Design a protein around this ligand. Structure first.
Ligand SMILES: Nc1ncnc2c1ncn2[C@@H]1O[C@H](COP(=O)(O)OP(=O)(O)O)[C@@H](O)[C@H]1O
Ligand SMILES: Nc1ncnc2c1ncn2[C@@H]1O[C@H](COP(=O)(O)OP(=O)(O)O)[C@@H](O)[C@H]1O
Ligand SMILES: [Ca+2]
Ligand SMILES: [Ca+2]
Ligand SMILES: [Ca+2]
Ligand SMILES: [Mg+2]
Ligand SMILES: [Mg+2]
Lengths: 74, 375, 126, 160, 375
């Protein structure tokens, strides 16, 4: 049963980062700068993702390399 | 390694996992169903921090790792061991991800709904698999046998299933499962060897004596007469050489170990022997097809690798049933892998490629609806 | 040939290796910049109304969540890869150990003290 | 021997003259004209420290280039320059993986002789065929035509 | 003198203290574990007022100083001698203060809690040390051996430890210590030499005969046969020249001195010989790994420097155990320092630099909690 909760926590992890946004107390000009901060968040996110991707690639090579070692000292 | 988009046939039978790609005639990755867990805590530095051994890695070290059986009688006890054995088979032997080919798994007859929903959920949510399918072992074994009629007797490690199929037709009402198999035989041999004088109480020795049984233990053609002639033993008792070197001497016990199958009273259970239960199952079937079930009975399971089962079955059925008709018992060679073989020949059909269950419909329907769709 | 020449070749290998690593790092930075410019494009707030800015912010929040979902999937993949790499590396260490534990000899007495004790005042360059 | 001979050639002429004088002092009255286990132990006593016999054997085995079981002048320089540990401070495992990757440019898990040769060509120094063969042997242990990661790790001893 | 911030490896083994910096292959400061105290009171003026000699300063003068052993069987008798030997090693040989580098000490298996708490308190409160760590000798010896499997037999001066380690796994339940070692052998040789005719009853002569034993005494390949052939001696008896000049003649006694290890009945103790105790320990282990323990047995301790121990062990184990398997015994060269060598290679790891115990946590926790943290 804890594994089902683990998948639920995976979805709950995504739920934690998102929070309610309020557009009623803001005026016309402020909303624009606030939109920009949301945009920078987007930017930031992809950057880390990109990093991970590149690392993933690197890590895969590692795996390959590692496999060869067990195929040379067996 | 694989250039054909075909399902991976992974028979997760109790006692031995047999995994391989579809189209092959035998499983390439064959390893026992055991999980070794570090018992103590070491102050040592440099060893693998891996907290969960599996397969041959656990078989190679049974003195340090406490051994746990991932399957008992059929009901799945621990799901972590399930995730461990599949993740291991995927990313340590086959060297292929499940995100590129289907997977035709084989489950035992009359299993819990929790087991099926759990494995399906681990195979859909956690691992990204394009399609899953649960199949009963008896049908695939009858496929590999190359027939459509007979009663399949599948004796695994902790469960024994009798499944009658006549004219390629299943009988879900007559399938009766009984938890008498290799583990209860290992326990009986262990307690009788403890009565002989060599006493042990650890699982590693239990696996060792299990292997000794697989290698030496056979079925008797006449229990009481062999008992009488073994009272004064000469060639009836054999001296086995333990892999460690200790000289063990085992005589009649061999052909009295599987006899517990024919006499469950030894383990104090009111259940009937495998032969008598099969006979009762035959009465539960209709009379018209009973002769065909007598003439086409098939066997499956690793436990059937003992020498002398066919003759014992023939004498017992002849003593129980009339001796006017013809009752031929057929056991195909390498029957143990036959089930898996069936899987292979079942995954190559285009129609079977049309009977898979994709992720999206399962996600909307949910696991319970998937249970209804299969049966 | 001599061994000193091989050591010189090896050290030259190391420096040309470091320069290559720096070049690869710069190329990775450039590729990251280009990928960022392609994926996350700037905004266009000129001419948007009150409700239009609200809808744009809601859409940006949805895109934020979608990117975080993708990043979380990739990070789970990276964690599985880290686990697999650690397991395989430790298995390789256990395999390759056997008899390959080294040390530097300690009877190799330091030359400075040895040079003083052997020569006295003659030892000036060494 | 690699770092040892490098340090030897790095010595000056006046230093090598002092080394020859010290050699003549050590073999002063010897019977083989070289520094054997006996003469090395005699020198160690004259200094103060006492050396184990198996240790004396292992040391003479770590300085000879001929095979005499004794230390001559060419080996006197090595035995008198080995003090500084040049092959210490091993590169981090991540740096070692980077080294293997950039030597394995075509992404295969093996440093074929072509990669090693193009690397030697790229370094700029005049690469001698004997140097290529000696490095190829030093790396490729089983002599299959390529340096795997384990053989590459073996290539890092005596290197810094 | 030292430009690297690394722990000082100080093996305080019973009989010989071996101190040196980490990274070295052999201890630089090697001196016996003895404390010489001025026996009489002199009216002389000008001599050192020092009231407590130690190490080589005591070895150089054994006629004036009454000799006391700072360690007996393993239990620390006097703590003043402990403070003396560490203060001496710190401010007379190494020429370095403990306030700049850690210190990896090595203690014997199965030692009292009072000993550990006392040494830790002297190393934290009195001396300002940034971090301490207690380590068992058997693990470091197995490290220096370059393996992970086998049973280490560490025979020091007053205690003998048998420690089985298979696949790196320590077995704290099977470690059995027995106080039979070099001191009881020196006592046996002394009483039998008193039986020969040369009688002495002072400790200086005891140390002299201990050195004579270390130099000459060896183990016999066949005790009774050597007794018979030595009855009529020719080359079996040797004439040793005492460092003072007195001509001593010692014959069979040599190879009968260590024999007391194999026959504790000589000292009237019901304990079993070292070989029989090791064999019993092997039965106490599991059968699966017993063959590996037979094939990877390792030795440690200065007492193992005698010639003929490996062959005697092989014949005795072959006579006790079956002769069907292969029982190879491996003794690495310079095994005595190997332990210390291990310490050196154990102090260079960064992870080990992360497993030290700093002052502040010990002060708040107290010594007993520190005992729980280590094990
Ligand atoms: N070669 C063999 N000889 C004898 N018995 C065997 C052999 N292989 C497996 N068994 C027995 O069969 C049981 C496991 O059978 P299993 O692998 O589940 O069969 P299947 O895979 O056909 O379902 C165990 O109890 C084991 O003792
Ligand atoms: N060179 C040697 N030859 C013979 N016996 C020795 C030698 N060195 C030490 N011993 C014996 O070993 C004992 C001390 O061993 P110890 O120094 O404690 O070993 P370790 O340091 O490995 O624990 C003493 O009883 C001594 O007689
Ligand atoms: Ca030479
Ligand atoms: Ca390459
Ligand atoms: Ca190679
Ligand atoms: Mg079966
Ligand atoms: Mg010792």
């Amino acid at each position: 049963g804890k594994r089902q909760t683990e998948r639920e926590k995976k979805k709950k992890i995504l739920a934690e980062r998102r929070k309610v946004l309020a557009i009623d107390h803001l005026n016309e000009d402020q909303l624009r700068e606030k939109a920009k901060e949301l945009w920078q968040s987007i930017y930031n996110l992809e950057a880390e993702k990109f990093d991970l991707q590149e690392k993933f690639k690197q890590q895969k090579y590692e795996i390959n390399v590692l496999r060869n070692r067990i195929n040379d000292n067996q | 390694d694989e250039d054909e988009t075909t399902a991976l046939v992974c028979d997760n039978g109790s006692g031995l996992v047999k995994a391989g790609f579809a189209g092959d005639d035998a499983p390439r990755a064959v390893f026992p169903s055991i999980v070794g867990r570090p018992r103590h805590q070491g102050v040592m530095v440099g060893m693998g921090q891996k907290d969960s051994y599996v397969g041959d890695e656990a078989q190679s070290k049974r003195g340090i790792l406490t051994l746990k059986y991932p399957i008992e009688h059929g009901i799945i006890t621990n799901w972590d061991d399930m995730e461990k054995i599949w993740h291991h088979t995927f990313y340590n032997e086959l060297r292929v991800a499940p995100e590129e080919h289907p997977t035709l798994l084989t489950e035992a007859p009359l299993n819990p709904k929790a087991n099926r929903e759990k494995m399906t959920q681990i195979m859909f949510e956690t691992f990204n698999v394009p399609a899953m399918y649960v199949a009963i072992q008896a049908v695939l074994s009858l496929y590999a046998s190359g027939r459509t009629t007979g009663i399949v007797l599948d004796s695994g490690d902790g469960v024994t299933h009798n499944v009658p199929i006549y004219e390629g037709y299943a009988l879900p009402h007559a399938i009766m499962r009984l938890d008498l198999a290799g583990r209860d035989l290992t326990d009986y041999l262990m307690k009788i060897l403890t009565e002989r004088g060599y006493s042990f109480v650890t699982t590693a020795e239990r696996e060792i004596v299990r292997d000794i049984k697989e290698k030496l233990c056979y079925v008797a053609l006449d229990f009481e007469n062999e008992m009488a002639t073994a009272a004064s033993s000469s060639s009836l008792e054999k001296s086995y050489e333990l892999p460690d070197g200790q000289v063990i001497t085992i005589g009649n016990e061999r052909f009295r170990c599987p006899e517990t199958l024919f006499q469950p009273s030894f383990i104090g259970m009111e259940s009937a022997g495998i032969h008598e239960t099969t006979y009762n199952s035959i009465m539960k079937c209709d009379i018209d097809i009973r002769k065909d079930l007598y003439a086409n009975n098939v066997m499956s399971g690793g436990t059937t690798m003992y020498p002398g089962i066919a003759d014992r079955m023939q004498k017992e059925i002849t003593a129980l049933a009339p001796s006017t008709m013809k009752i031929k018992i057929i056991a195909p060679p390498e029957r143990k892998y036959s089930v898996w073989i069936g899987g292979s020949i079942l995954a190559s059909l285009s129609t079977f490629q049309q009977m898979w269950i994709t992720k999206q419909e399962y996600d909307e329907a949910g696991p319970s609806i998937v249970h209804r769709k299969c049966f | 040939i001599s061994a000193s020449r091989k050591l010189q070749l090896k050290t030259l290998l190391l420096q040309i290796a470091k320069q290559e690593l720096e070049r690869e790092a710069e190329e990775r930075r450039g590729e990251k910049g280009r990928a960022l410019s392609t994926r996350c494009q700037p905004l266009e707030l000129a001419g948007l109304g009150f409700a239009e800015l609200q809808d744009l912010c809601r859409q940006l929040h949805a895109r934020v969540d979608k990117v975080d979902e993708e990043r979380y999937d990739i990070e789970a993949k990276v964690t599985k890869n880290i686990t697999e790499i650690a397991d395989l590396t430790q298995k390789i260490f256990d395999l390759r150990g056997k008899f390959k534990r080294p040390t530097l000899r300690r009877v190799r007495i330091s030359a400075d003290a040895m040079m003083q004790a052997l020569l006295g005042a003659r030892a000036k360059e060494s | 021997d690699d770092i040892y001979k490098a340090a030897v050639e790095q010595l000056t002429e006046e230093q090598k003259n002092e080394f020859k004088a010290a050699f003549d002092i050590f073999v002063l009255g010897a019977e083989d004209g070289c520094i054997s286990t006996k003469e090395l132990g005699k020198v160690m006593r004259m200094l103060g420290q006492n050396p184990t016999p198996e240790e004396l054997q292992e040391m003479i085995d770590e300085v000879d280039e001929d095979g005499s079981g004794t230390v001559d002048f060419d080996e006197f320089l090595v035995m008198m320059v080995r003090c500084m540990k040049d092959d210490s401070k091993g590169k981090s495992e991540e740096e070692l993986s980077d080294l293997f990757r950039m030597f394995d440019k075509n992404a295969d898990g093996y440093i074929d002789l072509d990669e090693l040769k193009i690397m030697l060509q790229a370094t700029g120094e005049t690469i001698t065929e004997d140097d290529i063969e000696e490095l190829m042997k030093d790396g490729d242990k089983n002599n299959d035509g390529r340096i795997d990661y384990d053989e590459f790790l073996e290539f890092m001893k005596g290197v810094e």
